[PDB]
Design a protein around this ligand. Structure first.
Ligand SMILES: O=C(NCCOCCO[C@H]1O[C@H](CO)[C@@H](O)[C@H](O)[C@@H]1O)c1ccc2ccc3ccc(C(=O)NCCOCCO[C@H]4O[C@H](CO)[C@@H](O)[C@H](O)[C@@H]4O)nc3c2n1
Ligand SMILES: O=C(NCCOCCO[C@H]1O[C@H](CO)[C@@H](O)[C@H](O)[C@@H]1O)c1ccc2ccc3ccc(C(=O)NCCOCCO[C@H]4O[C@H](CO)[C@@H](O)[C@H](O)[C@@H]4O)nc3c2n1
Ligand SMILES: [Ca+2]
Ligand SMILES: [Ca+2]
Ligand SMILES: [Ca+2]
Ligand SMILES: [Ca+2]
Ligand SMILES: [Mn+2]
Ligand SMILES: [Mn+2]
Ligand SMILES: [Mn+2]
Ligand SMILES: [Mn+2]
Lengths: 237, 237, 237, 237
């Protein structure tokens, strides 16, 4: 179908598809089946920050989610992304809900990808940063339930006007421009993505999470991906 | 029609529309009629570098074209670009020929725009750099005669396979993503664009030039803009 | 008589040396008397942001001070800094109180310097940023009363443990490294600086101010410079 | 016994201290004997590029050396540098010859250091770049035989006016400022370095090599370090 690499933040365990029985962060390579996961003491109603980072050299893909004044969960998995991904991709943030529900507000999102070549400073590069989202973001492709303008914030999931979240929503947000993520002849290729989010839920149990993801250029939301699939994968299979 | 701000490099004087009688650089605000110009000792067959820079603070738009081991022509004109331009634009390089002809090879092109807001480091930003152009550039919108892949270079104007240029060509190249160039509430807005080019002509007199330009999102090439209009303006009027 | 260039922020108008009546920002090029100024609707106890930007192309030095939800005071002055300044400088911040007094608290400070040249981005550069000041900052030079570590802030003037400002206080903080501020052979020579500050006085009347300055590598506080001279100038010439 | 971490590039294998037979690159963590290495198909007289990249999340230090149109030699090592290194270091380059000798010419060198934290990009950072070395570089610390200004290059080992390398030579160059390399409270602590170099010997056999190193602020050349120790380590322990 469409190739998907993503870093997932399960607020909701899904022991039927494999997810551990605790709020976790994890690395998904073409399958909601995480190839590596780590325990995340999630904080309800607090603004937190995720850093994603990968370099050709280590071939190690990494992520750190962390709150102020709080321990930070980290995950790392050796993968070679030119085998996996197409030469041109498009990056973005995705998030969704199920029975249980949560606010998936993205307060800020940045990202940087460099292609340093065999001759140095013959590099190629793209960096893009949002610390507030305007009422109309010409350069974000918004998919599903995604809405901007609410308090200068990106809401990937749907929320009622009073501020309570709603269930069984998928919204997904993408950068307008395609990213040349890797090349046949580059000595180092790298890419970092940082984004801060606010997850607050009225219910004691929230669901399902946020994921930063990378896919081929022409990606649209999978049918019936609402819930534990996070708007990234069509099937747990 | 479509609003156009651009820095022009006339290799060919056009004294019928106003252009001075020497190879010049100049500032065009919605009219091929340059509002300020400066003398440029152009160098045939040598790689040269243009720097464009503008900040909300000075409200002064500036450009410098310069060769290695050679004097550098500079131009500057006070303009306030939120009055002129739409809130969202799209940037790019344009170039064309007439009776006389030239190669308009773009060896590299970068650009950066920042929106620092009334609260600091609540900024918004986009930077993008090409030091080589691949056979297929997914993220460049190519218009008219524009072609990439030839020796890792962007050729805005048409060129025969042996390497000689051809006449009465317009090619124009644009960044896929729209640039949020200014905002109603930002204490400093700024944007810098740098690009290196190679102009070589078999004929003693070459024509017409290269221009970096900014326009509304939906800009396409004007009809009959080939020649002294540089693929930017429909009429000298 | 070390050479010194600066962007000053006067909370105290010293009418005999030329300070306008109203609290102003100004450009001080080699003398305390400001070459140009602009009215500044200062806000007591609110954090503000200073932006400062100059480049070899415009040859305009300029600056904007700005509080949230309030107009921003701006100023510009056409000056060629390679005439005025040595080839190699140190950059830094200064502030001072006299009979009247204020809290000169620096919350954050960053600075960029590029020497782009004729070739394909064969430039020389330096950038540094502080959103928190550590308890021992060994890459700042601390001069006078200046202190770090309290709340992660830089305090250029002396304050009590309760927080009360003191009178007749003078403090400077310089980046440890020397900056290559201009070159004989570089086609453009941009440099940008940004910083935030907190100014609060119990008093009806606060004094004197903060200034971003640039001077020689060997620069030290001029004697008897507390008060009107902001730790910058020996005399009021 | 100053503390020191480094990425070494051996043209001369010193088999008794563990250098493999073949010319190698390696990670030297607190001792000259390399913790891990990889074969390097060195090219005489051709400029090459070294890339070096480490981050607190992976906790992997790694590096790639690369010539145009040739495979690139790579190496990695899992090490937690805040255990090994002091909180505040200086970075720099070192190289040396012994009985056998080579030209250790540094054409260009850049370095980035970020201390991203838990908050919304409230980080601390430093970046610097050199594509040309000036005649007097007063923000490099020059140690040993190291010299600037010849062709705009850095020469870490001594060379004649004709260009002939010399034997038993040792040279280091450090950035003037101290780097905050890690923090107790920072959630990630990335740092990246890049540099190009020219290595040429008249001989069949060249020696010894160049190394990027990190050490304490007060670090100076260890005595008797020419030859195998590359200006880095007092002893071969
Ligand atoms: O008004 C006072 N007693 C009378 C004489 O003090 C001069 C001010 O009175 C002014 O009005 C009087 C009435 O017409 C005149 O008789 C004076 O000749 C003067 O013009 C007086 C009473 C208490 C004081 C306590 C601590 C102090 C520390 C330093 C200075 C000083 O060196 N101060 C020197 C003089 O005071 C102002 C200088 O300003 C200084 O302090 C300012 C504080 O903002 C700075 O802006 C400025 O750069 C200077 O450093 N002063 C005091 C001080 N002065
Ligand atoms: O081979 C020579 N004459 C014989 C004795 O020289 C030792 C090498 O001969 C080797 O083989 C011989 C035959 O089996 C043995 O009898 C020796 O005991 C030794 O193992 C000889 C002839 C001329 C010389 C001229 C200038 C010099 C400067 C310094 C040194 C030195 O300190 N040199 C010390 C010894 O030479 C190698 C050290 O390598 C040094 O130089 C290398 C150059 O790459 C570095 O890699 C390395 O780290 C060292 O600094 N040597 C010379 C030197 N040596
Ligand atoms: Ca889940
Ligand atoms: Ca023309
Ligand atoms: Ca004053
Ligand atoms: Ca060796
Ligand atoms: Mn899952
Ligand atoms: Mn014209
Ligand atoms: Mn003043
Ligand atoms: Mn070795």
């Amino acid at each position: 179908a469409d190739t998907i690499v993503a870093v997932e933040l399960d607020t909701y365990p899904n022991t039927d598809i494999g997810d551990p029985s605790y709020p976790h962060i994890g690395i998904d390579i073409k399958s909601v089946r995480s190839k590596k996961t780590a325990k995340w003491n999630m904080q309800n109603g607090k603004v937190g920050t995720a850093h994603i980072i990968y370099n050709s050299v280590d071939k190690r893909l990494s992520a750190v989610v962390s709150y102020p004044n709080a321990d930070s969960a980290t995950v790392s998995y050796d993968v070679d992304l030119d085998n996996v991904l197409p030469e041109w991709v498009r990056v973005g943030l995705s998030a969704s809900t199920g029975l249980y529900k949560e606010t998936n507000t993205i307060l800020s999102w940045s990202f940087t990808s460099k292609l340093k070549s065999n001759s140095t400073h013959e590099t190629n590069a793209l960096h893009f940063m949002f610390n507030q989202f305007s009422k109309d973001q010409k350069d974000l492709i918004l998919q599903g339930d995604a809405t901007t303008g609410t308090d200068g914030n990106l809401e990937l999931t749907r929320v009622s006007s009073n501020g309570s979240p709603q269930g069984s929503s998928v919204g997904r947000a993408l950068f307008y421009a395609p990213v040349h993520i890797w090349e046949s002849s580059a000595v180092v290729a790298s890419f970092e993505a940082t984004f801060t989010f606010l997850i607050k839920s009225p219910d004691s149990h929230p669901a399902d999470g946020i994921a930063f993801f990378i896919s081929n250029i022409d990606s649209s939301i999978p049918s019936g991906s609402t819930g534990r699939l996070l708007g990234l994968f069509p099937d747990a299979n």
